[PDB]
Design a protein around this nucleic acid. Sequence first.
DNA 1: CGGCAACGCAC
DNA 2: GTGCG
DNA 3: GCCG
Length: 327
Amino acid sequence: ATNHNLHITEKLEVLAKAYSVQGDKWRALGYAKAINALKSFHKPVTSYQEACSIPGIGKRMAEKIIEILESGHLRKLDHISESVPVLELFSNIWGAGTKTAQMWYQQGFRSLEDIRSQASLTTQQAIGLKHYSDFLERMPREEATEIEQTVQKAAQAFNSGLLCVACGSYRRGKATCGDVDVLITHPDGRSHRGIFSRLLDSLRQEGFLTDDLVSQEENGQQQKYLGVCRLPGPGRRHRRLDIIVVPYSEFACALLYFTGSAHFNRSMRALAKTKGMSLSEHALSTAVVRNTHGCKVGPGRVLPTPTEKDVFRLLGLPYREPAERDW
DNA sequence: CGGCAACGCAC
DNA sequence: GTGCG
DNA sequence: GCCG
Ligand code: NA
Ligand code: NA
Ligand code: NA
């Protein structure tokens, strides 16, 4: 879908990025949703009233949209802190968010070399810094495929019945991916247990995993690994890789969650909410039991969902293919 | 005005 | 408990 | 920022 409001959305993206790097995530979110709507509008926006009519665009956003449209500029841009470029630079380091970026900036740091030479770094941040360039690039989906096949080969050697699927943007069909998230499970509902640890060991022994950001995270019955991998061969770059092992009964909800996108997951959680349910990476459940003070006193009950279609069905929604889940 | 999800891990 | 993804 |  052609963007008939490019000059507009271009200036709005710069402002949104400013808010995002300085910590105002909620304000940045609002901009991102409004920007999406603009890029996909059938024609160049021509009036404030019309702008206001689009879902996601309120008075404030319409006010800026019309300003750019009629004046060609957005004055709010000329008042952006000069620090934004550096705050984005620092926040591009895996493990370093806005607060850390802010702190380093207040210490006078301005470049990556400054960081490497004078900044205090967590273990995760040091790995993120040393792979700065590799991690900022989006890999061709062809490489993500090789990464997924590598994990799957190691996994299936332990149990040929395991089901492995790369999620994230890869599953949504994008030509390039910022990372690879391999979701692993077993149809018999129990054989996924005792795989996670030895799978990581096997991949580590074979030289595929090069650094661990979080060797193991236990979220209910789900086990997650966050790390760094590199395919064999000269010229290969280091890439971000997550491996998640889950019980079959939660496979559909895990698939949906890790496939995303982050915006799609938000709309689905909100929608589940309007229907007295909650949707997480674990399951689709009925609303939690609350007391006189609207406080969690008892978990809602899990509504079994064998496949993603079941989740949409129970939510009264038409099924949506992964490629259609950017928003 | 408050919600926009909730959570685990590193520190 | 803060920060991060 | 947007929305109820
Ligand atoms: Na600003
Ligand atoms: Na970061
Ligand atoms: Na507010």
